[PDB]
């Protein structure tokens, strides 16, 4: 016989993929073409992630984007898990670049815009596609852009960062190659930068035959710039590929850039009605950074403080100079000094404490992680929680809970 999932019969294999190999489906009746990713249960049972796979399928499910490979349905069985996806011909962009040599402006601009909207879509949905390669992005019949493999992707959490580092050497951000904590939008921006570079020079901006010298090249923001293009794409790339994650460009920064604006359709970014729209998103909803500039009318309630001004020194959290293990121990004694109890998770410097409300039956938790600021000093972080009528406040209870703990740690 022949293997088939639902009305889709399997067939010729497309590739190896991240986990399982992918093959082409064909509708028994109509004959439509889809791409199914075959992940063998036996192969995914060996490695142990019981939440990573759950959230993966969860995220790609809701996603609908022209440049994001759209997950249709997921068919399951004790043998292996399947995912049917939109099939497109023209292979990976890596095959397109190499075969076509070096793309020009009028072209690269088109494609880069497309890909950047897909990742913007992802980031807006609180997910980060960590491994972004021209080898991971396909092209349809019309030679558009399609982001493909979400395997290495992860879902972003509030107040949470991402430890793990994975993937090939070249597209990995200067921070993830150094195995440091990241938010995840920036690691895509850097990964998108090196993609924009390959779409121009045909060669990777950071490439070496052996590591870490590739990482050493990546950590250093120096990279070859061909006479090939104008200085605008360079100002973009250098600000995008910046070694400092704080000095890097955000998804907003690229949108505002000049070279990125030219010949860019409206559909990609979901945005007299232009001035009227200002007010809808203007000073009313959010605060604008200081605009050297024309004098503007300050809000009446903001002037009296201001007219009399022209200090404010607010810190991070409790920060001492003691040793890593010698610190937490001097802390936990105070954590147990009160009624509050502590169950510490994986890291010895990471603790999760929670206590019952003294007035009511409510209970608020939190998270304390000990970081290292430099050679001579360490820092303790305080983070709130979540769970899923009341005479008390979850936000305030968090403060009082911390304040009481901090009181004993200081005086």
């Amino acid at each position: 016989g022949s293997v088939k999932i639902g009305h889709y019969i399997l067939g010729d294999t497309l590739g190896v993929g991240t986990f399982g190999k992918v093959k082409v489906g064909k509708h028994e009746l109509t004959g439509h073409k889809v791409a199914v990713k075959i992940l063998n249960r036996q192969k995914i049972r060996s490695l142990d992630v019981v939440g990573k796979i759950r959230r993966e399928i969860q995220n790609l499910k809701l996603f609908r984007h022209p440049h994001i490979i759209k997950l249709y349905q997921v068919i399951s069985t004790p043998s292996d898990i399947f995912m049917v996806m939109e099939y497109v011909s023209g292979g990976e962009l890596f095959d397109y670049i190499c075969k076509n040599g070096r793309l020009d402006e009028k072209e690269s601009r088109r494609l880069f815009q497309q890909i950047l909207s897909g990742v913007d879509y992802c980031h807006r949905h609180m997910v980060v596609h960590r491994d972004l390669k021209p080898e991971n992005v396909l092209l349809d019949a019309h030679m558009n852009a399609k982001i493909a493999d979400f395997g290495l992707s992860n879902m972003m959490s509030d107040g949470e960062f991402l430890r793990t580092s994975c993937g090939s050497p070249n597209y990995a951000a200067p921070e993830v190659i150094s195995g440091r904590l990241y938010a995840g939008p920036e690691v895509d921006i850097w990964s998108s930068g090196v993609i924009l570079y390959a779409l121009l020079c045909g060669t990777l901006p950071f490439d070496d035959d052996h590591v870490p010298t590739l990482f050493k090249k990546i950590c250093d923001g120096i990279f070859y710039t061909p006479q090939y293009l104008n200085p605008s794409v360079i100002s973009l790339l250098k600000h995008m590929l910046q070694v400092d994650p704080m000095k890097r460009a955000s998804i907003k920064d690229i949108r505002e850039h000049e070279w990125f604006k030219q010949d860019l359709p409206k559909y990609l970014f979901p945005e007299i009605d232009n001035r009227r729209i200002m007010n809808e998103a203007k000073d009313f909803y959010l605060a604008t950074s200081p605009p050297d500039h024309h004098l503007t009318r300050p809000h009446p309630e903001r002037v009296p403080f201001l007219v009399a001004e022209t200090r404010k020194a607010k810190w991070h959290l409790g920060i001492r100079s003691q040793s890593r293990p010698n610190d937490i121990m001097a802390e936990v004694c105070r954590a147990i000094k009160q009624l509050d109890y502590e169950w510490k998770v994986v890291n010895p410097y990471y603790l999760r404490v929670r206590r019952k409300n003294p007035v009511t039956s409510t209970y608020s938790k939190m998270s304390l992680q000990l970081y290292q600021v430099d050679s001579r000093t360490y820092l303790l972080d305080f983070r709130s929680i979540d769970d899923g009528p009341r005479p008390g406040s979850h936000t305030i209870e968090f403060f009082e809970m911390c304040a009481n703990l901090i009181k004993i740690l200081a005086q």
């Binding site: 309630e301 903001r302 009296p304 007219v307 005479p391 406040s393 305030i396």
Partner: protein, 301 residues
Amino acid sequence: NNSVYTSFMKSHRCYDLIPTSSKLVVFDTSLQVKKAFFALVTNGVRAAPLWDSKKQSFVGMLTITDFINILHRYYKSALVQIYELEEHKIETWREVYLQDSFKPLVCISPNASLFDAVSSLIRNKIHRLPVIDPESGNTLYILTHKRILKFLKLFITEFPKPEFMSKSLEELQIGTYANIAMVRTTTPVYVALGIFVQHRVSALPVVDEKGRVVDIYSKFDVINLAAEKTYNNLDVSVTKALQHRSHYFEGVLKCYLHETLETIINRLVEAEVHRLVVVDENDVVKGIVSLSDILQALVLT
């Protein structure tokens, strides 16, 4: 006349009113009043929700009005005493404030309609209505008469518009012309607070010998005394107190009786003030139209 503005408020929750990202400070009832008021000018906010550590709940609100009351209440002379205020504490002052009258904190769920909010503002006669999520119990944003008017004109559409607003102010009889609480330019800032405590008015337009409006002293203007730490001297003129911003403001926002209601609301949400003083050719006082008047001219009409 209620076909549109009245329905609109019932069809939109206070949620849409809340800024994307805002800032709010809350004081403990155990905190000293002196430190509290200074915190108000440093953070920019004119209102803070009062939190009780023992009751573990929100007992009430703290506005500039409080600073006005306690200033007029305990005062001896500009030069003789910095005494009463310093030691006094938030809960201790609430005790002598509630000694006369008992009025618990009012609040509205962010899921409640905008019509419920505008009701709680007129019914309770209050400018600060905190929105608190009943599920979490956390105060989100402090609703304001200004915040609503802005939201109203900005969000409301073009279509149902053509009829009632066009009618002029003089003919609509909106706002109080009967007794106007005002201060001279030479009147001490103390007696200004004395009028602020007697009448629940939120501002006192200043006048010269001719009765013309050369400036305005708002309940918010007095917080500057705490900002500049000049609150010790209450013997100064309101003109002397408003002399700090005198090099900044354009003039006194106002309107005319024969002007359309429409033209008034626009100029009002754009200037982002709480009221306008209607006048004549001589710029002499006629009456006062505040946001409370406009809001009360909507809910029923």
